Design a protein around this motif. Structure first.
Motif, PDB file in Angstrom:
ATOM      1  N   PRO A   5      -5.009   0.623 -11.930  1.00 41.47           N
ATOM      2  CA  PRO A   5      -4.368  -0.688 -12.079  1.00 41.47           C
ATOM      3  C   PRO A   5      -5.346  -1.829 -11.819  1.00 41.47           C
ATOM      4  O   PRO A   5      -6.142  -2.170 -12.694  1.00 41.47           O
ATOM      5  N   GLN A   6      -5.282  -2.409 -10.625  1.00 39.57           N
ATOM      6  CA  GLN A   6      -6.415  -3.137 -10.065  1.00 39.57           C
ATOM      7  C   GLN A   6      -6.174  -3.493  -8.602  1.00 39.57           C
ATOM      8  O   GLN A   6      -5.095  -3.245  -8.063  1.00 39.57           O
ATOM      9  N   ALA A   7      -7.186  -4.073  -7.965  1.00 42.77           N
ATOM     10  CA  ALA A   7      -7.223  -4.164  -6.511  1.00 42.77           C
ATOM     11  C   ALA A   7      -6.922  -5.583  -6.039  1.00 42.77           C
ATOM     12  O   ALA A   7      -7.824  -6.324  -5.651  1.00 42.77           O
ATOM     13  N   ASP A   8      -5.652  -5.970  -6.101  1.00 39.41           N
ATOM     14  CA  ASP A   8      -5.012  -6.675  -4.997  1.00 39.41           C
ATOM     15  C   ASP A   8      -4.773  -5.706  -3.850  1.00 39.41           C
ATOM     16  O   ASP A   8      -4.310  -6.090  -2.776  1.00 39.41           O
ATOM     17  N   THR A   9      -5.097  -4.441  -4.094  1.00 42.41           N
ATOM     18  CA  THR A   9      -5.029  -3.414  -3.075  1.00 42.41           C
ATOM     19  C   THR A   9      -6.289  -3.498  -2.232  1.00 42.41           C
ATOM     20  O   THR A   9      -6.301  -3.051  -1.091  1.00 42.41           O
ATOM     21  N   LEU A  60       0.822  -1.205   0.000  1.00 43.14           N
ATOM     22  CA  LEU A  60       0.000   0.000   0.000  1.00 43.14           C
ATOM     23  C   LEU A  60       0.856   1.253   0.000  1.00 43.14           C
ATOM     24  O   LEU A  60       0.422   2.304  -0.469  1.00 43.14           O
ATOM     25  N   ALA A  61       2.074   1.132   0.519  1.00 45.85           N
ATOM     26  CA  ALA A  61       3.005   2.255   0.571  1.00 45.85           C
ATOM     27  C   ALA A  61       3.568   2.651  -0.796  1.00 45.85           C
ATOM     28  O   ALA A  61       3.944   3.806  -1.006  1.00 45.85           O
ATOM     29  N   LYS A  62       3.623   1.696  -1.721  1.00 44.13           N
ATOM     30  CA  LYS A  62       4.157   1.937  -3.065  1.00 44.13           C
ATOM     31  C   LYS A  62       3.042   2.193  -4.070  1.00 44.13           C
ATOM     32  O   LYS A  62       3.168   1.887  -5.251  1.00 44.13           O
ATOM     33  N   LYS A  63       1.954   2.773  -3.580  1.00 42.40           N
ATOM     34  CA  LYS A  63       0.777   3.074  -4.389  1.00 42.40           C
ATOM     35  C   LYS A  63       0.802   4.454  -5.043  1.00 42.40           C
ATOM     36  O   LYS A  63       0.877   5.478  -4.362  1.00 42.40           O
ATOM     37  N   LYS A  64       0.704   4.477  -6.367  1.00 43.31           N
ATOM     38  CA  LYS A  64       0.746   5.733  -7.102  1.00 43.31           C
ATOM     39  C   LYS A  64      -0.392   5.880  -8.100  1.00 43.31           C
ATOM     40  O   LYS A  64      -0.608   6.965  -8.642  1.00 43.31           O
ATOM     41  N   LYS A  65      -1.125   4.793  -8.328  1.00 41.76           N
ATOM     42  CA  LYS A  65      -2.228   4.779  -9.295  1.00 41.76           C
ATOM     43  C   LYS A  65      -3.623   4.844  -8.676  1.00 41.76           C
ATOM     44  O   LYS A  65      -3.808   4.526  -7.501  1.00 41.76           O
TER      45      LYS A  65
END
Length: 238
Positions: free
Chosen positions: A145-149, A136-141
């Motif tokens: 993209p898609q949600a494994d987030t 979650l810390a390396k999130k920029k989109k």
């Protein structure tokens, strides 16, 4: 608006229970005691929340800050190391968070995060928590993209939000926090967890009439107010 103390995710010396107990102490400071209710009742709901829990989870390489609204113990968004705030919801909704937030493009209910799946499917634990934070810390989109987030968010939601709310969740999670196979909730626990507000209305109801029979509780395996009192740690104001 309290900044909970930091949780060193990777550091096995800092147990999950001590984090939960710590953060509950902070929340309870904004709770009230209702006659007839075992648990400390949370601030009453508002369209625009006034009390916030900012809980930082930090690994050995990165970290994120959770933005939890106290009045219903509910993750609203999170901040990345780069200082970017992401909030559950989408374009056209009203931002609850400040500092120029961005929408994730999806809500933060067990609907939006995992569909009709059961909470038993969500794997948790120190490793899961570590993986979730770093990712979650390396999130920029833009939820895009898609949600494994979504998957990383639901684990934190259950480990943190539900852990703070239920003594059932907090003990289950803690007891299996450092295991290799991770840790998950039982099917029954999951049904109770998805019913927090309902168990909470029951609490009030059992304050009015201690003897009252409540099938919404019987059906969940919660016999009476004594049983509910040991499952839910903090109750939602009703």
């Amino acid at each position: 608006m309290k900044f909970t103390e930091i949780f060193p995710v990777e550091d096995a010396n800092y147990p999950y229970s001590a984090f939960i107990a710590s953060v509950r102490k902070d929340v309870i400071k904004h709770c009230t005691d209702h006659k007839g209710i075992f648990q400390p009742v949370l601030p009453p709901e508002k369209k625009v929340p006034e009390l916030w829990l900012y809980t930082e989870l930090k690994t050995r390489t990165s970290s994120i800050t959770l933005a939890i609204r106290m009045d219903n113990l509910y993750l609203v968004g999170f901040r990345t190391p780069g200082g970017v705030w992401w909030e559950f919801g989408k374009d056209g909704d009203t931002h609850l968070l400040g500092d120029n937030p961005r929408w994730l493009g999806f809500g933060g209910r067990y609907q939006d995060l995992i569909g009709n799946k059961g909470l038993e499917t969500v794997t948790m634990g120190r490793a899961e928590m570590t993986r979730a934070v770093n990712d979650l810390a390396k999130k920029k989109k833009m939820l895009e993209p898609q949600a494994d987030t979504k998957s990383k968010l639901v684990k934190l939601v259950v480990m943190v939000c539900e852990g703070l709310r239920f003594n059932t969740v907090s003990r289950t999670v803690d007891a299996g926090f450092n295991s290799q196979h991770g840790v998950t909730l039982t099917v029954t626990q999951g049904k109770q967890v998805q019913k927090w507000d309902r168990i909470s209305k029951a609490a009030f109801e059992w304050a009015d009439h201690p003897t009252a029979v409540i099938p919404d509780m019987q059906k969940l395996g919660i016999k009476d107010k004594n049983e509910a009192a040991r499952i839910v740690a903090l109750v939602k104001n009703q």
